[PDB]
């Protein structure tokens, strides 16, 4: 309640920082060890669990280095030496994150991780990505880094172990910039690779390292997706575009799921109202120059058509307006078109004498 009148002056030196962490970027790591079991968030270096082994310390320290800014937060999950990955994955479903990597792993477990990521992205429509060692997956949510025998310091780090540094570097990059041609100071040397083989390897869709210009740098920022459908775009291979799109998709959830799920009748008028709300949200993002102008939001005609054909509806002799007016039970189909600017990666200069 009321106390005696108080005058207190506080002196604090809030100047103890360098290479400040970005607001965005969350990395989740799952590990096998005998101690410190459970989730142990790591905000910075000073708060590191002491009971961990040397290998886990090395992996965490590798993951603690960014490109320009350090990652916002680290969620380290520790599992016992003999355990299945399903329990850790189900526990991580509750938590939210951007990237997931596991330094020590086997061939069979990578299949489970890839399957989980695909199911989460498609069935549940939650946009997360994982960085994996040698997976040949054909999905935009999978990143495979396929160079071996990286010499950081005096140790021949394995590819799976260096996926941690890859994930940290990816998380550290700001939104405006990309991860192409970024130099790694720590790395010393790479096993020999000819230029044409590296070009073909990255064309297949891979994350690699090459020695070009002054020092070692990442060849390209492509994804694992290697084939393009009519609906899918060529811009979906770039990591930066996918990251921005997933940020936007996660942000629109506070508009969609918070209010329009379970609280509003599913009628075409309410669909139009929701479309207007989404467009008005996109205008603000356009005004901040995050995306390009002229972004349109409208009803997904083809998916609605497919769902209507799934049930007992004769799609013939129906007006397009009649198709759009149809009540699709308790599900809503929407489609948006937005554009994201890529970074400068190719230059063609012609000089006339």
């Amino acid at each position: 309640a009321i106390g005696l009148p108080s005058i207190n002056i506080s002196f604090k030196e809030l100047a103890t920082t360098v290479k400040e962490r970005s607001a965005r970027g969350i990395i989740a790591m799952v590990l096998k060890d005998a101690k410190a079991l459970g989730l142990n968030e790591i905000h910075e270096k000073e708060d590191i669990p002491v009971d961990l082994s040397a290998e886990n310390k090395e992996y965490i320290n590798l993951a603690l280095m960014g490109n320009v800014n350090t990652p916002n937060k680290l969620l380290v999950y520790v599992i016992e030496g003999e355990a299945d990955i399903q329990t850790a994955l189900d526990f991580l479903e509750t938590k939210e994150f951007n990237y997931l990597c596991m330094p020590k792993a086997v061939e069979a477990d990578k299949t489970a991780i890839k399957n989980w990521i695909i199911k989460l992205r498609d069935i549940d429509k939650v946009k997360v990505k994982a960085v994996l060692g040698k997976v040949v997956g054909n999905h935009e949510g999978i990143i495979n880094f396929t160079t071996e025998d990286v010499l950081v310091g005096e140790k021949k780090y394995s590819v799976d172990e260096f996926t941690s540094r890859v994930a940290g570097l990816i998380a550290g990059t700001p939104l405006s910039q990309s991860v192409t041609y970024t130099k790694l100071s720590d790395v010393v040397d790479i096993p020999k690779m000819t230029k044409v083989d590296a070009e073909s390897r990255v064309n297949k869709g891979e994350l690699i390292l090459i020695k070009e210009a002054g020092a070692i740098r990442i060849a390209r920022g492509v994804n694992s997706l290697t084939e393009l459908t009519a609906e899918k775009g060529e811009m979906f291979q770039k990591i930066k575009i996918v990251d921005t799109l997933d940020i936007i998709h996660s942000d629109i959830r506070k508009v969609i799921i918070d209010d329009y799920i379970g609280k509003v009748t599913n009628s075409y008028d309410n669909k139009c109202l929701l479309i207007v709300a989404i467009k008005s949200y996109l205008e603000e993002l356009e005004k901040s120059a995050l995306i390009e102008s002229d972004s349109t939001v409208e009803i997904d005609f083809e998916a609605q058509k497919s769902y209507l054909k799934s049930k007992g509806v004769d799609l013939s002799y129906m007006t397009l307006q009649e198709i759009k007016e149809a009540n699709t039970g308790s599900k809503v189909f929407l489609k948006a078109k937005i554009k994201v600017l890529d970074a400068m990666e190719d230059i063609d200069l012609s000089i006339e004498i």
Binding site: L273, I275, E298, T319
Partner: protein
């Protein structure tokens, strides 16, 4: 062929459906300047901008406009709204919807009545940008 009748008209204002609405109207007026070019008798014009204008007419069922803007007008901050108009005559083939954004109202009518006359309220407004849904 039939021409759409205005009896089948619905209006949404600020996300709420306006049950009573007699008429709705929105127009864009262009700004032009006369330019005379040497050697030509006919006079040409250059388009330099546009203005959005419109109005609503609704019966005095409730005190909607006051609850909308009254206190904020006194405080010194002017609010902006979004209105949606839908025109769907069953005889005609299709429907038409328009979204009008950045609406500002010209005046407020506190009270108006006369003996033997049902009350009506009309409020003009000005807008900046529009978006089109379900184009015929």
């Amino acid at each position: 062929r039939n021409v759409m009748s205005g009896t089948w008209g619905e209006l949404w204002l600020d996300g709420n459906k306006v049950a009573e609405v007699k008429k709705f109207q929105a127009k864009m007026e262009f700004t032009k300047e006369d330019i005379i070019i040497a050697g030509q008798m006919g006079t040409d014009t250059k388009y330099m901008g546009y203005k959005g204008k419109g109005s609503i007419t609704l019966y005095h069922v409730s005190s909607r406009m006051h609850k909308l803007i009254g206190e904020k007008i006194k405080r010194g901050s002017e609010p902006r709204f979004v209105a949606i108009s839908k025109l769907n005559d069953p005889d005609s083939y299709g429907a038409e919807r328009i979204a009008v954004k950045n609406i500002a109202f010209d005046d407020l009518t506190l009270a108006d009545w006369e003996v033997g006359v049902k009350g009506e309220i009309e409020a003009p407004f000005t807008f900046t940008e529009y978006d089109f849904l379900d184009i015929i």
